[PDB]
C-alpha cells in the first residue's frame, strides 16, 4: 500500500479536527491561559535518519533505534540540517507532473523519540498525540505498532494512542515522505522542504470531553448590544446529569454566564443533537474588536455534572466584531474597511519552515509599526500560535486553504476534477474546523493559483453554509469567478488594463464597474516587492483612498525567502534558488520582500509605511487640516510635532496635542512663523508621534509625516568677482587649466575630463563621462535568463539595442579662454552598429573661483528604448567616512519611489549609501538632490545620485551581495535624470509611462567645487 | 525685469552675451531668466534660456520671449504641429509636417479675444527673411497680448505696426472641463520651477 500515491487516502485513523484544546481541569487556569499539565510538548531531541526512498528503510527500526541515526532537534525541516537540499522553484513542479504518483527516490525521513507516559494518563482518558506540521505525509507507529497515518503538510494530524502505550518509557517511529499525493496540491512559489516542522504534543483528555465548540457574536444595529451564541459538542457517556457552563470574562470581571444540559433543538423528523448544545449569552455595551484596539474578552467552556464536578474545561479569546460585506463594501463592525495589508510566508533564513514565537513577534511589531494591519497567510493554515498573537496585538487575517497546483496545465486541471474533490475538501474543512473562533480571522480564502474548478464551487458553499460569519475569497480562474465574494486580483495595475484572453487582469478602477459588478476589490497581491521595488505604491494608496470600493491589498510580501550558507571561512550569506545544487530553480523569485531574511528593513518598508499612514494632512496658509482614517479609535496616544526649516536649518518647531475622532478632522492653526528674507526655500514638516509605549510601538514612535514647501526667496546676489582667472595650456594631447592649487586636465582624444588635482593631489581614478545604463534591476530583468530570453523586458531591450555596449565619437573638443575663465565645449556621439542612439553636448566653466559649471544636453533617438538614466559617472580617488546632502532622504529614493522621503540636509556614513539587496542591482539612489558633499568635493544642480565603491558593471557582473568587494575610491553616479524602477509585477515591464525617459531632450547642469 | 548682470566675452569664432535677470514683485522675486546668446560666423544666433519660477507664485501661463518684428509678411510657414491652432492640453488632432499658411490664419478670432492661435511642437519657423529653429510652442500676429486683454470684443481689436511674435519653451493648458473653477489638469501646470528651452534666430 502506497497510500502516499493515492489522493483517495488523505488519512488513516486520523481524528477528527477541531478547535485549540488544552483540557485543563481546573476553570480558573482556562480563564487565565496558563499552561495546562493535560497538554505536554514533545519538542525537543528525537532520534533521525535519513534514507532515500521508503523501501530502503529497515524493519527494525520499528522497534529499535538506528546505530546509525543522529540526535536532531524537533521541529525541524531536515534540509536544514543538510541531510537533502531544499529545492527553490517556482511554478514548475519539483516532481514529474504525473498524478497521483510521485518519484520513486523520494527521501524518507525516519524520526524516532523515546518518551515518559505517567501512568495516571493511562489509568482513565484519552491520551492522542499531535503533530501540528508534517511535511508531506507520514506514518507512525507507537511501541512498535502501526497506528495510522497523514497528510496536508499545513495542519495538526492527531492520533488516539491510548491503546498503545504503556507507563514508563514509550517509542514513537514516525516515516515522513518528501514526496506524496498531497505535494500536486502544494505547489506554492517557496522553498520545497520535508520534516515535522511544527510542535509535537500529546493531550489528555478525559473519555466523556468537549470535542468542538463554536463561538460566534451577533450585534444589534448599533452595536450596543450583542448575543455570544457558543454551540459545543460532547463525545462520551452522555448523561442527564450532564452540563455545560459558558462564561464570559472582562479581565478579571465575569461579564455574563450560561447553563444548560445536553440536547439541542429539533433538527428534523428524527429529533436534534442529543451530544450538543448551544449557550446564548446577552452582552450590553460590549467592547469591540478591530485591528486598530484589539479588545478580547475570555469565554471559558466547563463540561461538568450539574451537582458540580469539573470534567475539564476549554477555553479561547474572543473578539466582538461582525464582519459583512453589504452593499458592495467589506464592513467591520458597520465600518468599511481599508486594508494595509501583506502576504506573509513562514521562512527563517536559519530554521527554514519552523516558526517561533519570537520570530512572529518581530514579525508582527515591525507590521504594526510600519502601518500594516492586515495579513494574508500565503498560501496555508499557520503555525496556530499565529492567530493568537494576531487576535491579541490586533491584525486582520485571511486564513487560507494549503490549496495550489499552479504547476497543472491548465492550471484548474485537478481542482475541476471530482476525483481530487475529497483531497481539496479535507484542505478547506479542516481548516475551518481549527480556526473558526479566531476574531482575527476575517476572510476565508480557498487557496491559491489553481485555476477554477467545480470543486472551488463546491467549498465556497460549504464554508458559506457551516460560517455565514466570514466572508470567502479566492482569486483563481480571473478573481472574480462564482467562488469569491470579493474581486481579488494579483498584481492588477491602477490605470493600465491587461486584457490577458480568458484571465484578463482589469485596472482595479475599471474592473469595479463593469457590467453588472458590484463586489468590493482587495488585492490578494499587488506591489511585487522583488529587489529594488515597490515602484508606484503611491498610485495605488491614491486610488484606495479614492474609490470607496476600493478597499486596499496585501503586499508581495513581507520577508525575502533566502538562506543562509557558509563560505570556505564559515561566514554566512544569503543563498537563493540553485544555490543548493537544486535544479531546475527559479533563482531570486524567492526573495520578495519588504525585510531582509533576519528581518533588517528594505528601502520600499518606509515608502509602505507613509502610504499607509492612519492621518491624512492638508495645507492652507499655515492652518494644518488633520483627517484621521481611524474607524474606531480616538487619537488617543499622538501628538503632532512639526518644524520649519529653511533649506535644512531649522527655524522653529512646536508640539501640539491630536485630538481627532475616527473619520474626524482637527485643524491647526500654526504660530506665526518664521519669515526669512535670506535665500532658500523654507518647508514644513510634520510627524505624529506617540507619545506613549504601546504593545507594539515604543515611547516616541513616529507613525506618520508629511513635508510641504512654504515660502521660496530665489537667490537674486551676486557672487563677488574674483580676484584671479584660470590658465589654459593646450597640446595636441590636452587640455591643461589652472588656477592657484587647483588644476583640471581635459582628453583631447577622448573628449572628457581625464583628471583633477586638489593641493598636488589627483582626484579621479577613471574620466568623468556620460552614463545612459544602469545595473539592472529584477523588475528590470523580469523572467529574462540567458538560456530563455524575454525581448520585451527592459534589460534585454537596452542589450539589443546596445546601450551597454555602445562607445563615445567625439564630435567636438575646443577650449577659449574668457575674461574671467576657461570655457571648454565638448560634443559626442554614442553609436550601435550604424545608429547613433544618444548625443550629449557639454560645456565646462572653470571660473576664478575655482568652481567648474558643467552644462549637459543630451539627445535620445526616439526609435530606441528609453533609457535607464541620463548622467555621468566617474570613480573618485578618496574615499571618505561620511555623505552629506541637502535632498531626499535619508533612505534609498528613486522617481517613482521617493514619497517617503523627506528633503533635509542628511549625513550618513558611506556604507549607508549602498543598499545590500542579495541579487545586487543599481541601488542607494538619492532623488531631488541640491548639493552633494564627499571629502573635499561639493556638487550643486538638482539630480539624482548614488555613491558607493561599487562600480556599475561590477553589480551588473555580480549575482549574490556577498562575492561583491570594494573597489579602490567610490564611484559616483550624477543623474539629471533616471528612470522609474517600477514593480506592480516582476515578469512584465512596470515602469509607468510617466517615470520613462522619453522626452528626446534633456538638459541638467552641476557645479563642482571644492572646500 | 531688474538685471542682473550683462557680459561679453569673444571666442574663436564667436562672440557670447550672458545676461541675467530677476521680474521681482512688491520685493519677491518672482522669476529669474539666465540666457545666452552666441552669435556664429555662420550668422546664427544661439539662445539659450534658463529660468527659475518660485515655487510659491502661482504656476505662470507660459515662459517664452516675445518681440514685436518691423516687418509684415504674407505667409507663415512651420515645421511642427498644425495647422490649425494648437495647446498643451488641446494638441491630439494636430499632425506634425510642413504647413504653410497667410498671416491671418494664425489668428484665431474669439469674439471675446485673448491668447490665441498658438502652434505647439515646432522645430523651425519661417516669418519674411527671418528663421528661427528650437522645440518651442509660438503665436504671431498683429496684435500684441497687452491689447487682447484690454480688448472686449474682436472688432475694436487694431492691428499694431509690424508683427508681434510670442515664442515660448513652454505654455500652460487652457483647461475647459468647465469656465467657472480652474480646470487645467496638473499635468499641463507649469510647476516644474526650473525650466530649460533654447533656440538659434537666423536668417533666412
Ligand atoms: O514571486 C511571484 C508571486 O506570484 C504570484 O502569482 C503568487 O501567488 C505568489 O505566491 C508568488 O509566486
Ligand atoms: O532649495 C531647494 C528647494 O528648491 C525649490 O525650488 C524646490 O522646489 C525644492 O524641491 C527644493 O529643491
Ligand atoms: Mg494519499
Ligand atoms: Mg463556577
Ligand atoms: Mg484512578
Ligand atoms: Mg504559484
Ligand atoms: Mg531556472
Ligand atoms: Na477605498
Ligand atoms: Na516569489
Ligand atoms: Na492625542
Ligand atoms: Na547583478
Ligand atoms: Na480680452
Sequence with gaps: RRDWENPGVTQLNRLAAHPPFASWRNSEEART???????????????????????????????????????????????????????????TYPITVNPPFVPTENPTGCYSLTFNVDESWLQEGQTRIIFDGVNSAFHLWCNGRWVGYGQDSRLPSEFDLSAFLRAGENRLAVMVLRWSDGSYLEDQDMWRMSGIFR???????????????????????????????????????LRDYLRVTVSLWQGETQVASGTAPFG??????????????????????????????????????????????????????????????????????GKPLLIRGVNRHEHHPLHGQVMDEQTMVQDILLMKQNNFNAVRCSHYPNHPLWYTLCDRYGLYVVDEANIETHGMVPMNRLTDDPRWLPAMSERVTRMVQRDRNHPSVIIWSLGNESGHGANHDALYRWIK???????????????????????????????????????????????????????????????????????????????????????????????????????????????????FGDTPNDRQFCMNGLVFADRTPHPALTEAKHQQQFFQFRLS?????????????????????????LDGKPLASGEVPLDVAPQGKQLIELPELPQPESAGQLWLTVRVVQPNATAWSEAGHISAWQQWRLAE???????????????????????????????????????????????????????????????????????????????????????????????????????????????????????????????????????????????????????????????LNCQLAQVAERVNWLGLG????????????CFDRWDLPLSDMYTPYVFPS??????????????????????????????????????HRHLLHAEEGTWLNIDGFHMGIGGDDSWSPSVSAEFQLSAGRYHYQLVWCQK
Excluded at 504534543?201 to 448590544?225: C, E, G, M
Excluded at 466547563?302 to 461582525?322: K, Q, S, Y
Excluded at 532623488?927 to 561599487?950: A, K, M, V
Aim: net charge negative; glycine share 6%.
Design 465 to 579: 453554509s457551516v460560517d455565514p460569519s466570514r466572508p470567502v475569497q479566492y482569486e483563481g480562474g480571473g478573481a472574480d469567478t462564482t467562488a469569491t465574494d470579493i474581486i481579488c486580483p494579483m498584481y492588477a495595475r491602477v490605470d493600465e488594463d491587461q486584457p490577458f484572453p480568458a484571465v484578463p487582469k482589469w485596472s482595479i478602477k475599471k474592473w469595479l464597474s463593469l457590467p453588472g459588478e458590484t463586489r468590493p476589490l482587495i488585492l490578494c497581491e499587488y506591489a511585487h516587492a522583488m529587489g529594488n521595488s515597490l515602484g508606484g505604491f503611491a498610485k495605488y494608496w491614491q486610488a484606495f483612498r479614492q474609490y470607496p470600493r476600493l478597499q486596499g491589498g496585501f503586499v508581495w510580501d513581507w520577508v525575502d525567502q533566502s538562506l543562509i550558507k557558509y563560505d570556505e571561512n564559515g561566514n554566512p550569506w544569503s543563498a537563493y534558488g540553485g544555490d
Design 713 to 871: 526667496n530665489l537667490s537674486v546676489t551676486l557672487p563677488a568677482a574674483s580676484h584671479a582667472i584660470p590658465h589654459l595650456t593646450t597640446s595636441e594631447m590636452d587640455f591643461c587649466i589652472e588656477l592657484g592649487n587647483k588644476r583640471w586636465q581635459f582628453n583631447r582624444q577622448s573628449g572628457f575630463l581625464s583628471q583633477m588635482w586638489i593641493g598636488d593631489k589627483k582626484q579621479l581614478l577613471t574620466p568623468l563621462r556620460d552614463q545612459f545604463t544602469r545595473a539592472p534591476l529584477d523588475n528590470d530583468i523580469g523572467v529574462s535568463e540567458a538560456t530563455r530570453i524575454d525581448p520585451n523586458a527592459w534589460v534585454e531591450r537596452w542589450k539589443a539595442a546596445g546601450h551597454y555596449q555602445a562607445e563615445a565619437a567625439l564630435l567636438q573638443c575646443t577650449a577659449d579662454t574668457l575674461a574671467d575663465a576657461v570655457l571648454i565645449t565638448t560634443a559626442h556621439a554614442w553609436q550601435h552598429q550604424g545608429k547613433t542612439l544618444f548625443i550629449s553636448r557639454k560645456t565646462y566653466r572653470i571660473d576664478g573661483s575655482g568652481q567648474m559649471a558643467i552644462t549637459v544636453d543630451v539627445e535620445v533617438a526616439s526609435d530606441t528604448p528609453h533609457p535607464a538614466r541620463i548622467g
Design 264 to 333: 439541542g433543538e429539533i433538527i428534523d423528523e428524527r429529533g436534534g443533537y442529543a451530544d450538543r448544545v448551544t449557550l446564548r449569552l446577552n452582552v450590553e455595551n460590549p467592547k469591540l474588536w478591530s485591528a486598530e484596539i484589539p479588545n478580547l474578552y475570555r469565554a471559558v467552556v466547563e463540561l461538568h455534572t450539574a451537582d458540580g464536578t469539573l470534567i475539564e474545561a476549554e477555553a479561547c479569546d474572543v473578539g466582538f466584531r461582525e464582519v459583512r460585506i453589504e452593499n458592495g463594501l467589506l464592513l467591520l463592525n
Design 33 to 91: 491561559d496558563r499552561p495546562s499539565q493535560q497538554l505536554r510538548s514533545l519538542n525537543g531531541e528525537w532520534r533521525f535518519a535519513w534514507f532515500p526512498a521508503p523501501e530502503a528503510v529497515p524493519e527494525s527500526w520499528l522497534e529499535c533505534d538506528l546505530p546509525e541515526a543522529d540526535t536532531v532537534v524537533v521541529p525541524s525541516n531536515w534540509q536544514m540540517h543538510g541531510y537533502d537540499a531544499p529545492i527553490y522553484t517556482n511554478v
Design 199 to 237: 510542535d509535537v504534543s500529546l493531550l489528555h483528555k478525559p473519555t466523556t470531553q468537549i470535542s468542538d465548540f463554536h463561538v460566534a457574536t451577533r450585534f444589534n444595529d448599533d452595536f450596543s448590544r450583542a448575543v455570544l451564541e457558543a454551540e459545543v459538542q460532547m463525545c462520551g457517556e
Design 621 to 645: 496658509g499655515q492652518t494644518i487640516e488633520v483627517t484621521s482614517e481611524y474607524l474606531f479609535r480616538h487619537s488617543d496616544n499622538e501628538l503632532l510635532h512639526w518644524m520649519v526649516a
Design 922 to 959: 543599481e541601488n542607494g539612489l538619492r532623488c531631488g538632490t541640491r548639493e552633494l558633499n564627499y571629502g573635499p568635493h561639493q556638487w550643486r544642480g538638482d539630480f539624482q545620485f548614488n555613491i558607493s565603491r561599487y562600480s556599475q558593471q561590477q553589480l551588473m557582473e555580480t549575482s
Design 890 to 901: 535619508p533612505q534609498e529614493n528613486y522617481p517613482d519611489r521617493l514619497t517617503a522621503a
